[PDB]
Amino acid sequence: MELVVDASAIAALYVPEERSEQAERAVSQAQELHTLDLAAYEVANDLWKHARRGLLREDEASNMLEELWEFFKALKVHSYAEVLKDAFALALKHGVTVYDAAYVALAEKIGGKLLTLDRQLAEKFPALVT
Amino acid sequence: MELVVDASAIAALYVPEERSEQAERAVSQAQELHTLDLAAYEVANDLWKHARRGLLREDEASNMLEELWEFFKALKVHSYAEVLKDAFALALKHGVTVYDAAYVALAEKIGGKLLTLDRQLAEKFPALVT
Ligand SMILES: [Ca+2]
Ligand SMILES: [Ca+2]
Ligand SMILES: [Cl-]
Ligand SMILES: [Cl-]
Ligand SMILES: [Mn+2]
Ligand SMILES: [Mn+2]
């Protein structure tokens, strides 16, 4: 099983975090983890929000961003060129953002599934989500 | 002059659109245009919004996304790996999003300037923006 992990899924893995048994089994059993270039910015941005809200010290958030960087080396990172056209058509059809549609496009492309903690996304693509 | 164009700047160029004399002179005089992988998703997402709001027919929005794709071949497209660490530190320091900070990080990296139609962004980096 090829497994796409979006930004919410990476956030739960790259540092110690609580995860459903379901999430863990998917990651555990995957042949390989895949994501998009996009996820790097999305995870980093969520880290920025946490810092500015006073939940992380600035040096602590900077250290975590190093860890994210190191985590990304264990991922197969795909580019926008591979999915952009499919992502847009999926966004138009299903009424989800191109950002979200992109991960679904990628799961389809690699013949795999998507792990997302986004329940709303997960409901729109039952055949593609774990 | 190396010129970074963000998503708002690409939107004004990849199809016939009104532009300030200032924007035109910057693009005209640039040695080369540069952007991020990120901009592809951001422009496509803005196109999706326009379609869903009833401003573009679905086939018309799909044709424009083809044009965007063809436009991107004239751009030097840089990846998240080149800017992510700088983008985060700039986001923390200046109180802007990692998404925005990324283009500024890229202008700095290539020794060039940034063309953005985002006045708020443009005010935070006067030395880096056209
Ligand atoms: Ca396709
Ligand atoms: Ca640097
Ligand atoms: Cl916030
Ligand atoms: Cl909208
Ligand atoms: Mn979401
Ligand atoms: Mn903006």
Side-chain angles (χ1 to χ4, degrees), chain A residues 1-17 19-20 23-24 26-118 121-130, chain B residues 1-17 19-20 23-24 26-118 121-130:
Chain A
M1 190 207 25
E2 307 299 346
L3 185 71
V4 173
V5 289
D6 75 357
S8 68
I10 296 176
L13 295 161
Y14 85 98
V15 289
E17 288 293 10
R19 320 162 182 117
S20 55
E24 276 222 358
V27 181
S28 187
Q29 288 176 159
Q31 160 75 197
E32 188 176 14
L33 306 192
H34 300 256
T35 201
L36 292 168
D37 46 11
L38 174 63
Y41 298 107
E42 292 181 315
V43 182
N45 203 69
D46 177 73
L47 195 56
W48 171 77
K49 285 171 169 169
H50 281 71
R52 70 194 310 246
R53 292 171 191 180
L55 300 178
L56 299 166
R57 288 168 320 251
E58 287 172 292
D59 270 347
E60 170 183 15
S62 289
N63 286 348
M64 294 173 62
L65 180 86
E66 294 277 42
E67 292 185 69
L68 177 63
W69 179 260
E70 293 305 327
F71 187 74
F72 260 64
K73 303 173 180 184
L75 307 178
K76 183 169 183 170
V77 180
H78 296 254
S79 88
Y80 72 94
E82 299 175 46
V83 300
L84 187 73
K85 290 189 196 187
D86 292 345
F88 187 81
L90 284 168
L92 276 189
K93 184 178 191 279
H94 301 274
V96 300
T97 67
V98 176
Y99 305 121
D100 284 345
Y103 294 93
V104 175
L106 174 69
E108 286 210 286
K109 181 182 205 272
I110 75 195
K113 296 208 187 301
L114 167 67
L115 172 69
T116 176
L117 284 51
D118 188 306
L121 190 50
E123 273 190 332
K124 285 209 164 143
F125 302 94
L128 277 159
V129 181
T130 61
Chain B
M1 190 207 25
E2 307 299 346
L3 185 71
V4 173
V5 289
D6 75 357
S8 68
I10 296 176
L13 295 161
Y14 85 98
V15 289
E17 288 293 10
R19 320 162 182 117
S20 55
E24 276 222 358
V27 181
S28 187
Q29 288 176 159
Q31 160 75 197
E32 188 176 14
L33 306 192
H34 300 256
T35 201
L36 292 168
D37 46 11
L38 174 63
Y41 298 107
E42 292 181 315
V43 182
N45 203 69
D46 177 73
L47 195 56
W48 171 77
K49 285 171 169 169
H50 281 71
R52 70 194 310 246
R53 292 171 191 180
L55 300 178
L56 299 166
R57 288 168 320 251
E58 287 172 292
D59 270 347
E60 170 183 15
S62 289
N63 286 348
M64 294 173 62
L65 180 86
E66 294 277 42
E67 292 185 69
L68 177 63
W69 179 260
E70 293 305 327
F71 187 74
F72 260 64
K73 303 173 180 184
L75 307 178
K76 183 169 183 170
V77 180
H78 296 254
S79 88
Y80 72 94
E82 299 175 46
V83 300
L84 187 73
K85 290 189 196 187
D86 292 345
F88 187 81
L90 284 168
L92 276 189
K93 184 178 191 279
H94 301 274
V96 300
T97 67
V98 176
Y99 305 121
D100 284 345
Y103 294 93
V104 175
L106 174 69
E108 286 210 286
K109 181 182 205 272
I110 75 195
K113 296 208 187 301
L114 167 67
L115 172 69
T116 176
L117 284 51
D118 188 306
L121 190 50
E123 273 190 332
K124 285 209 164 143
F125 302 94
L128 277 159
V129 181
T130 61

